[PDB]
Amino acid sequence: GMKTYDLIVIGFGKAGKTLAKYAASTGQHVAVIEQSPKMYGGTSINIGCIPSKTLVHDGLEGKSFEASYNRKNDVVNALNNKNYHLLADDNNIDVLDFKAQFKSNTEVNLLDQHDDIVDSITAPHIIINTGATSVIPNIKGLDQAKHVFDSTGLLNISYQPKHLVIVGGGYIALEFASMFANLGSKVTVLERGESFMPREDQDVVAYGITDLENKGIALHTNVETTELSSDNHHTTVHTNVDNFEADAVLLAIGRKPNTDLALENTDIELGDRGEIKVNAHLQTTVPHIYAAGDVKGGLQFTYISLDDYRIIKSALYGNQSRTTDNRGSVPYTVFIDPPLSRVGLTSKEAAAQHYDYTEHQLLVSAIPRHKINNDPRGLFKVVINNENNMILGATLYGKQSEELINIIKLAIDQNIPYTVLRDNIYTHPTMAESFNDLFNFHHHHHH
Amino acid sequence: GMKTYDLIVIGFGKAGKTLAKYAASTGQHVAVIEQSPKMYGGTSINIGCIPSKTLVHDGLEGKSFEASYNRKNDVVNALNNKNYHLLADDNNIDVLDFKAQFKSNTEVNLLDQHDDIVDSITAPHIIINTGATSVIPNIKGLDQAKHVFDSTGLLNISYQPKHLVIVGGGYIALEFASMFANLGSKVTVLERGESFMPREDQDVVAYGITDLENKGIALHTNVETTELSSDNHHTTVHTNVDNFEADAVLLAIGRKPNTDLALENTDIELGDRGEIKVNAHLQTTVPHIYAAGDVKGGLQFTYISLDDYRIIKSALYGNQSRTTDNRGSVPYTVFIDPPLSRVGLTSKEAAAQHYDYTEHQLLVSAIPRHKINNDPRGLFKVVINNENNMILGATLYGKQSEELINIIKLAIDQNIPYTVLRDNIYTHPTMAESFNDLFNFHHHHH
Ligand SMILES: Cc1cc2nc3c(=O)[nH]c(=O)nc-3n(C[C@H](O)[C@H](O)[C@H](O)COP(=O)(O)OP(=O)(O)OC[C@H]3O[C@@H](n4cnc5c(N)ncnc54)[C@H](O)[C@@H]3O)c2cc1C
Ligand SMILES: Cc1cc2nc3c(=O)[nH]c(=O)nc-3n(C[C@H](O)[C@H](O)[C@H](O)COP(=O)(O)OP(=O)(O)OC[C@H]3O[C@@H](n4cnc5c(N)ncnc54)[C@H](O)[C@@H]3O)c2cc1C
Ligand code: NI
């Protein structure tokens, strides 16, 4: 309460740094509290999207593990520095190097590295933007096992593992599996559930599994992990299936909201999944405090955090019309090799909801651009509503899908019927022009 | 004509093979006449888009000249064979291995390899789909010069040139320049006019020229090429600026409609640039004869020939609403490295056409995904109409632009204002999400 600001952002995350710079541009004095200098710019810059896809990219080029990890460090360092200065060099923004914890509903304590309160600050509005952290499972032996990593640890590993065992079969785990396979590591993936990528289209998943296994990746389902044991050299994952000996183990079973904020000092309520409860305007249960990004639950994407900035900007400075209920369709990409990109419904979901739908598909081996790419792998699939010819969903598994899926997102939001994408002129030779064939079909009516 | 078909297609081009397969699917008996088995599937498959970009793609990966040319041969052979059988195996299509020339308005002579007439055929509708060919300049010494190629010859060359001299500086010429530089050849480009890519945005072109020159490519403007002379091993390109010693010369100064069809036997008229004259439905001056693709003039793109199939299909089988006047916005890509993609107007054109416009730009080095790509080169630039916030044009020079430009094409056609692209959720980390910044700007009224 000692030092007053117009706005406080807790965490140097995506929504937070974007909102802080906007507020400063209006003349408001902003405090951005960030607990680690290694996290300037947030998770995407330092321990997530950017380093991981740098390694994905360079591995597809056949670059070595060493060369790829070295260039990843240069990329992260450069973008960390440039993100830091974008905020800190602004006269209306103070980047405060402390761990934040609430003193009350109106006052935020600033803690040094020894967990001591050094100062306190206040502002009429407070934005919680503290992200998520890797879930640590309760597994016998984990607390003293060597050679065990979360995603952050693995992105900073000091050696190439000859054999990586991944505990977890979700999208991030599978990204790391393809990433390390393409860098020359043997990879084993252990999924507790009955299948990989449930909720994705099962025709597409079958090709994706084939393509993973053709890289020499071993995939296991129904795996119950009971214990970790380790040497100076190896770590064994003991399971109901088998004992898997590894040179490194990745724990990738989920990410939980980071709410270590002394919330007991506030009226801020948490939900059933540990997330900060927010309304459609991202207001917490304390009206002048908002929460943005992974910490408020739901989807964990950098662009959802960016959209949260749009919502909070709309609430605080705009016409309040933007909410979590009018984001538009949310696309995403699973960065296996090639990438699996998705927006909207699968044909299974369209049928379950009793849509009168038509599905159509196109193997990437039937797309002439695949010859130029020297890559025949993949499957493109679309689902359309016969009642109005609008697109209900698409799954693009294949090269360039992380770019192309944005065309289909735009079409869904703007009610562009599938016949327009069928008949359009596209550049050539490209992956985009495959839409002339992907959308070349007539109704198959379902009663 | 001795034998009668429901439809005759002259040339195994893009519009033609697409229309043949559609017509056959309605039960019609189709003849497709093609003069060369090296051209099943047309120019794109055999001597144009597909082989050139195969070499572009593999050269960006650092593959050797020999490895890239060998795989190019594999790609062309596979797709040529696939295209041939897609038509020939069809019960309702005959692929006829002859050179076509008109006998009259209603029947087509079939010529053997010695230009002798073998037979003739007729059909109530005839589609001319014969494409274009490289323009041959009048340069002293060309008749007897060794080591000189057009685009087809260069794509089938049997050795790696140590020094390729390109006579011509248009888009296809520049694609070959970057293609051979990336395979390790030295390249010199000779442009007769005062600048390269004069129709493109000049800020972008300046970056494009720097990036070509950083590859070691020499670029010359105001070049008059006066003579070619040759050794058993080298060819001298004689020029007003200097003589250039090379071991291969590419002549790339344009492509003219291929109308070698004995049109004097018909009422089909040609326009002032040698093109077959067509109306908006692609009808020639003989109403039952249509022309599609490069041969009827205008833009030479594979996707224009594909859209010509759509127009002729609408004319002969549909509601005839489809014309050359409602194609929508036509994007294109100059496949230098990185690709320069464009749709709609430049700033210069917008100012000339009296718009109240705003331009905005974004360097690729300001796009965080460029770090993942390991490539900081490029410039994205957009032009919007301040009257209605619609997009007038865009120039995307940088990686993935040949895919991204299609997003902007769709927005222009569907009247999606630039603010929707500014505010949209994009996947991450991608080149597409740069649109959040590229379109983040306000009016500057003119
Ligand atoms: C391996 C991996 C790969 C991913 N790949 C993708 C991808 O391809 N695409 C995609 O869209 N998303 C991807 N994500 C997810 C994406 O990175 C996150 O969803 C997004 O970055 C979350 O941003 P945020 O704004 O919620 O906060 P964050 O960017 O996580 O920032 C929160 C900040 O708050 C700080 N902080 C926390 N508590 C305190 C405190 N008490 N005091 C002070 N500071 C504090 C943290 O140090 C951190 O810097 C990936 C994630 C991981 C782990
Ligand atoms: C090097 C190069 C690169 C290119 N790159 C691109 C690119 O990236 N993107 C793009 O969109 N476009 C590109 N193009 C242009 C594109 O290839 C053409 O615009 C398009 O392929 C022309 O198609 P078409 O339908 O007009 O006929 P074509 O595909 O040219 O087919 C005409 C056919 O008619 C046959 N024929 C001619 N006369 C007769 C006759 N008398 N009897 C029988 N058969 C006959 C020919 O043998 C040929 O098979 C490129 C062109 C070149 C040369
Ligand atoms: Ni119907």
Ligand code: NI
């Ligand atoms: Ni204005």
